[PDB]
Structure 1
Amino acid sequence: MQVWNPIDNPKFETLSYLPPLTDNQIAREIDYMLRNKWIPCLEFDPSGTITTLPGQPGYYGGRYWTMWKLPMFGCNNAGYVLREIEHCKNAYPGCFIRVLGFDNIRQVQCCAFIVHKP
């Protein structure tokens, strides 16, 4: 029998229950988005809390982050996405950073995972 820790144990959605992610395993999730013709993007924010309202169902605060430059339309190689992450983290070394993708035919995001923590 073992006990799960309730104090100071935050989580960050998908892939947060596995061992930490290495640099190889990161450029295998981008070649899967490129093989299906999706569009990469980047974001950053200094905090991650959630706020509500008294009597309004389905309203939450803290779901929008700030966009780095613009979506990378017409991209074929995975060596540019990896270089943009390094430019992002040299200017803001005290924020979180997250990677997304875009399906343009169904208009919905397809991926999300964290690559940097403060």
Structure 2
Amino acid sequence: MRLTQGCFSFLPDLTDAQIEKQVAYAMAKGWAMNVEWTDDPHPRNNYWELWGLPLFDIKDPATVMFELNEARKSCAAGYIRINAFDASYGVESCVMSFITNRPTNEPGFYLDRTDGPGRQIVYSIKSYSVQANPEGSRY
């Protein structure tokens, strides 16, 4: 299965050059970029691993791209996204987030059903990758 988190995931995996253009857009709008990694694809995994600090000062897309590829080369098999962050008043949040990397063999999830009161069901979404192996050796 294809993990469809991120905002460009019904399109094909983005090229370096297509990512640079999205970075350019975000930098021209004043936003701060950062890169993050995980091998827990659970939809409620809010906190992927920071790759360094967000790049607030930077005036050139190539810097984000250079950091992306350094992260690519150091991190284990998994997922990397780039986020754009807007410190503006009345936003103060992520305004863009898309997957830059995804492992070849994502098995995905199964739905785990526990009986609640009456007909109610207690759902837990369970990842095959995560239950079989620890962080760093899941893909």
Q: TM class by shorter-chain length?
A: 0.7 to 0.9
Quote the residue 1:111 is aligned against.
96
Q: Give the CA deviation at 1:24.
A: 2.1
Quote the residue 1:25 is aligned against.
18
Question: Per-residue displacement from partner, 1:40-60 (whole Å, max 9, x unpaired)?
Answer: 11110112124xxxxxxxxxx
1:42–1:101 CA distance, 2 compared to 1 (3 A): same
Unaligned runs of 5+ in 2: 104-139
TM-score, normalised via structure 2 length: 0.66
Q: How many residues align?
A: 101
More strand by share: 2
Q: Give the CA deviation at 1:18.
A: 2.0
| Alpha-carbon distance between aligned partners in 2 of 1:9 and 1:71, rounded to the nearest angstrom | 27
Identity rate, percent: 26
Any idea what SS the aligned residue of 1:85 has? helix
Any idea what SS the aligned residue of 1:84 has? helix
More helix by share: 2
1:64 to 29, 43, 47: 47
1:25–1:92 CA distance, 2 compared to 1 (3 A): same
Assess if the C-alpha contact under 8 Å between 2:6 and 2:81 holds in 1.
no
